[PDB]
Amino acid sequence: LPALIDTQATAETRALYRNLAKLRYKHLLFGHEDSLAYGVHWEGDMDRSDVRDVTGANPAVYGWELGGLELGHTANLDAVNFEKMQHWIKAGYSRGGVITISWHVFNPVSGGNSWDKTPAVHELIPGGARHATLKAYLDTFVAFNEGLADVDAQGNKHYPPIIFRPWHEHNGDWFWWGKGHASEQDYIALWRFTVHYLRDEKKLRNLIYAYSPDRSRIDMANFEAGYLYGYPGDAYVDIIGLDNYWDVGHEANTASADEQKAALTASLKQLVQIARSKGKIAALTETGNNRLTIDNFWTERLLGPISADADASEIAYVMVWRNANLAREKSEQFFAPFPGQATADDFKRFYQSEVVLFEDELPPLYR
Ligand SMILES: OC[C@@H]1[C@@H](O[C@@H]2O[C@H](CO)[C@@H](O)[C@H](O)[C@@H]2O)[C@H](O)[C@H](O)c2nccn21
Ligand code: NA
Ligand code: NA
GH26 domain location, by residue (predicted)? Predict the structure, then answer.
């Protein structure tokens, strides 16, 4: 019964959304960022994943990241070559996996990265002096998306559906599009333009739009109000997402493990209730425990609290962040295990659970 904001979405895109809406009651798709590009201990192989090395299966959802595309770079901000990324997206889609894309856009005013807080949103939105820049930036994605297309024997063009998740964690103050650096109304104008430009002016038909505040900056006593800070309206959002590293053991969170588990369940319950009221689909669009230091992280801190409540359980997917390559990134950073890592057997159990789906047990999502 949920309907996409693109009334003309491709058959495959419509089918994905419909099939997520059906499977969410009894299942949870697992996702991983940059999962085919590299792992903690390897880079270069054209068909490998840390996740598959542990479980024998690829993630169901593949996350990818565009930062740097807008600057005409050959590779993204983490040195993922864009041509290889296009081939990895096509490969995952060909196996029936789901594609999601985020975009840590560089600061156009200073040339710094997304964490450079020099104000820019007011200049980028319609009427702003740098509005031409925003168009040029979005045009680089249009071009990237064309490199994902195939043409069938009858001459018809086909694309992978993409869950496009821009301008994330906007209730935080860490990105230049965040609270304190952009007004709420300017953020909304930025989001609305992004949709109007891609969906209406450029006529992309293979996008599903995901909204993703950060949990850590929402007051649990007033969840809906906090979640809806900067919300652009139901005509602009398909997935009611959430980035929640906080309730899964973030080092700065002084709450007890039991309080954290209760808060994870409550956050996802309320997320799902918002989605239900709006006729959308909810998802835990980012989470994880950096360096997987928590014993039985997967079953005790993620799956248990999700499965505890039948509302919380109605999220469609959960994605964890990237497994940065040690040989080149000097800071150890990873969110899925690799063989021999302490949580590997517990991640096998997470995989094995009837609820959780990896690529190998997905139904046909695109028909
Ligand atoms: O802090 C973890 C994660 C963030 O991770 C960063 O992601 C960028 C882009 O891939 C990368 O260059 C950095 O090295 C680092 O991995 C990311 O911003 C993500 O959206 C998020 N949200 C909360 C925590 N993270
Ligand atoms: Na679910
Ligand atoms: Na399973």
Answer: 11-360
User: Measured between alpha carbons, how far is 236 from 231 in angstroms, rounded to an integer?
Assistant: 9
Pairing outcome for strands 157-158 and 150-151 = antiparallel
* Rg of the chain over all Cα atoms, to the nearest angstrom: 19
Residue nearest to atom 25 of ligand 1 (CA): 321
Cβ–Cβ under 8 Å, residues 322 and 34: yes
Q: Which ligand is nearest to the CA of 348?
A: 3
Q: Do residues 33 and 13 make contact, with C-beta atoms less than 8 angstroms apart?
A: no
Question: Is any atom of ligand 1 closer than 6 Å to the C-beta of 78?
Answer: yes
Looking from the CA of residue 329, the nearest atom of ligand 1 is 14
SS (H, E, C) 33-63: ECCCCECCCCECCCCCCHHHHHHCCCCCEEE
Domain count, the chain: 1
Q: Is 217 in the pocket of ligand 1 (CB under 6 A)?
A: no
Could you tell me the two tokens for 61? 């959802």
Q: Which atom of ligand 1 is nearest to the CA of 33?
A: 10
How far apart are the CA of 269 and the centre of ligand 2, in A?
Answer: 11
Residues labelled catalytic: 169, 286
Residues with CB under 5 A from ligand 2 (ion): 24, 28
User: Of the ligands numbered here, which is closest to the C-alpha atom of 60?
Assistant: 3
Resolution of the experimental structure, in angstroms: 1.1
64 lines ligand 1 (CB under 6 A): no
Which experimental approach was used here?
Answer: X-ray
- In angstroms, the Cα distances linking 295 to 292, 332, 336 are 8, 18, 13
CB 173 within 8 A of CB 179: yes
Any ligand 1 atom below 6 A from CB of 322: yes
- Domain with 154 in it: what CATH number? 3.20.20.80
d(CA 290, CA 341): 13
Identify the H or E element spanning 5: none
Looking at ligand 1, which residue's alpha carbon is closest to its atom 14?
78
3-class state of residue 366 by DSSP = coil
Per the CB < 8 A criterion, the answer to whether 182 and 117 are in contact is: no
DSSP string of 193-242, one letter each residue: HHHIIIIIIS---SEEEEE--BGGGS-GGGHHHHHTTT---GGG-SEE--
